[PDB]
Amino acid sequence: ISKDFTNLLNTLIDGQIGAASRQTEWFNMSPDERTDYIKQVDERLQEMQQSTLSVLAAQHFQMQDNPVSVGDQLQTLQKRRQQMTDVPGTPAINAYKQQLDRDILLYRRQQTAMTHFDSTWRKVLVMLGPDDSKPLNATTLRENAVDKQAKLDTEIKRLEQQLTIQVADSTFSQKYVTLFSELQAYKDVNARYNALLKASATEEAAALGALTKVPQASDDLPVNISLLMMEERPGYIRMNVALVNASTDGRFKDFFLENGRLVVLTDGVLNFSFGTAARSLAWQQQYRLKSEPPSFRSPTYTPIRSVLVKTEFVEKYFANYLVSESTLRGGFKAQLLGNGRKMLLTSVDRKVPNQIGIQVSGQAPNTTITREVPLASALSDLINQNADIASFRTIGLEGFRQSSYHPDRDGLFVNIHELERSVGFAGRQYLLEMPQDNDYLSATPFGVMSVDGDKVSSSHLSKAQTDTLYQYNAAFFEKLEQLRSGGMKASRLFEGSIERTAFVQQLVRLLERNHITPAGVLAPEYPRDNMRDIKGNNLNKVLWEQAFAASVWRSRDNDPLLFRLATRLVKNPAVVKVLQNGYVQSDIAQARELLAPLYEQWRTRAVEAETQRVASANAAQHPSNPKVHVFDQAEVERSLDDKLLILLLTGPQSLEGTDVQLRPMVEAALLSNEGRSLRKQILFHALRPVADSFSKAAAPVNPHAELGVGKIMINNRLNQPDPYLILNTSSEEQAYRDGSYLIKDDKYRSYNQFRPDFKNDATRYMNDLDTPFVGGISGTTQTVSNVLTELFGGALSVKQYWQFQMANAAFMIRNGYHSFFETFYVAARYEPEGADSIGKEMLQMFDKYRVEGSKKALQGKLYDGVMARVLPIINQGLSAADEFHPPRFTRIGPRPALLGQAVKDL
């Protein structure tokens, strides 16, 4: 709001632009984007105050050990609040107080409900039991049956009536929770009593146990009381169902409002869930409670569909499922709807309670045979009966349409909006500064980020470090909070103040540490060629290279060459080494999913091997050890993954024996787009260890004078791992434990480990061309292309060569391993000698554009210069209708091609 804060932001913006080299996350903005940027700066600063400094305060204000107990939760929270009612007002403090208050309310409600449940249970057991002239026993309970079953029914009816009246109450209340707990107690005791009456002589003692076993240990709630605690308003639970994507064309499961009625787009969806989390994972770890398993949060990340539904419907069919306690459940349950239809309930998660797979099915309307079939309309109508028509909403829908607009791109993120939409997201974790070291460092509220050339870690904070971090950061945020309101008069950051300069020097590095920079947040509709990506690469060239990689990847053109390569390569013994790579294990899991019937049949074979292991361990003479008298999980898992790898490299023709009966299915699978793309994505990962296994020395065939004769200046990287981009992709919650941890090596880490070494001549060259930079000149591509004559066992045609090398370059761009240029440069250096070779020209063209780029923006001219020379060699055999043509670089963002495959019927 304050004009002074706005002038300060404009000052630091202008100054940081003026200081810029090439490759910077700042760039000059439109005079409209300026305001959206400042608005997002202010918003995200408020988010920081509410959502990271608050949780840091909740670990500074721990200097005295309050009374703490896992059972006395309500009292522990209450005294934690009374510890801090004296603390001065501050937004992080107010947010902490309000969170603790709401959690106090919830725990109070739950404890009340459990108490009145227990008292009602005891009361009903006294009512059903005999007089004190006899002990409570099954015989007297049976003698009581004919009267007190009807008494139980009468009380149940009365309670249901009174509670249905009380549902008119506008908010949760003592009477509401009371009557609810009574109704649940009466229902459960009635059910257990009737089970006892039905119990045989062998069951009777167990049913009497189940009656006398009050849940007074409070080790888990009554299920219906858990549903009560999930109620968003008295008598109603919030249902939700999560999409794969917004299904405007029917490709995805969906559930949407159509003509006032709610409509499921498909006959069942695996992705329903009920309730909502009471607090973020940050607060969950601050309380040091168990965090909800990630299999709830992992499976989808796009906007989610939700409405309030009548709790009676949920508790009728779905309370049978929703129990957190391990009641025996299979893969499925089938529920008779009163209209004669089935509803199928599906155990889509074997640990989490509150997410459900649901399907309705029944006798197909208006058909010659009474086949039962799934029925989306029946489910829609049943929901519309049980739903409230009011307060249907889609979570984040405008956010999606105002940041992604649609499923945007087939490649890595470009700004934080695409990151937060990406599968890697989990929750936005801002970092803050730990400046009392000799040079400034980044810490979470739980731990300071250890960084190393090989490794990234956090050391958890001891108390002195928490006091340092809190007091410093709080003093800074207090200054910022003053500046927004009391202005320069209050903050005393006068224009000549050394304190003002220190403040700005801190703010700029805060706004760098989190990618709140303009390239991080602006996400424009049509990218001006001035703008730069989140790493300071030119935006439009990155977009174009991604669209190129996508188009090359989707084409079916190179596949006859690549699968010949794979068919030969699979014979090398070294290919086994590929499977122990950490990144391959990301994607063979998807092959385990695609080939589920094979993955199951194979595993059902493999589990046999345990029997031979135990047999051999018993056949060994006088075994002094259970030498292998165990189920070795790792052995079978390795052998299974090796089988799946081999079945992915060589074609389905490799199938043999009984599995030939399944071979037509596997053939239909592997020829899908996801099949081909997996097959070649695993092929290219398999290529590197085989290439390395020849250990042939470097020997480029085209010399180049500008960049050192006979060598290449490969790799060319400085290891400078970005902590924010690491933590804002889903590491395990082991990072969040308040305990020291070593972070996962996700595939994006290869995209985030590296920063250009501006001292190297190769960097100077590339900065002259002003290409994007990702991991430097690709020594991997050198090592591969040096041995192609041995991989294929003979010289390639320049057509076959350039085909393979473009598929490789598309693979490198798709996974974010390198730029276009970082591959094609070493290609042109390695292109075989021959009558149609073109690398000599390509080198001279690079030099020609270098001597320009040091003065002028090339605006994609380099890419056209390359494609002009490559395309007529690739398409040399093809008809003009079937040629490949990449998307065409333009001032506006990359537009679709106008020729060949890309138009044919697409």
Residue numbers in the entry: 4 to 909
Original authors' sentences:
To understand how Mcf1 is built in molecular detail, we heterologously expressed and purified the full-length Mcf1 complex from Photorhabdus luminescens and determined its structure using single particle cryo-EM to 3.6 Å resolution. Since the toxin proved to be inherently flexible, we performed a series of signal subtraction and local refinements of subregions of the complex. The resulting composite reconstruction allowed us to build 92% of the Mcf1 atomic model de novo. The structure reveals that Mcf1 is a monomeric, asymmetric protein. Based on its overall shape, reminiscent of a seahorse, it can be divided into two parts - an N-terminal head and a C-terminal tail region. In addition, we noticed a large spherical density of 10 Å diameter in the middle of the head that is coordinated by five arginines from all three head domains. Its location at the interface of the three domains and coordination suggests that this is a negatively charged molecule, which stabilizes the head region. We therefore call it head-stabilizing element (HSE). Interestingly, these putative receptor-binding domains are arranged such that they fold back onto the tail towards the head, resulting in the C-terminus of Mcf1 to be located within 2 nm distance from its N-terminus at the neck region. Moreover, the C-terminal region forms multiple hydrophobic interactions with a helix bundle of the ABD and supports the helix that directly connects the head and the tail region of the toxin, thus organizing the neck region.
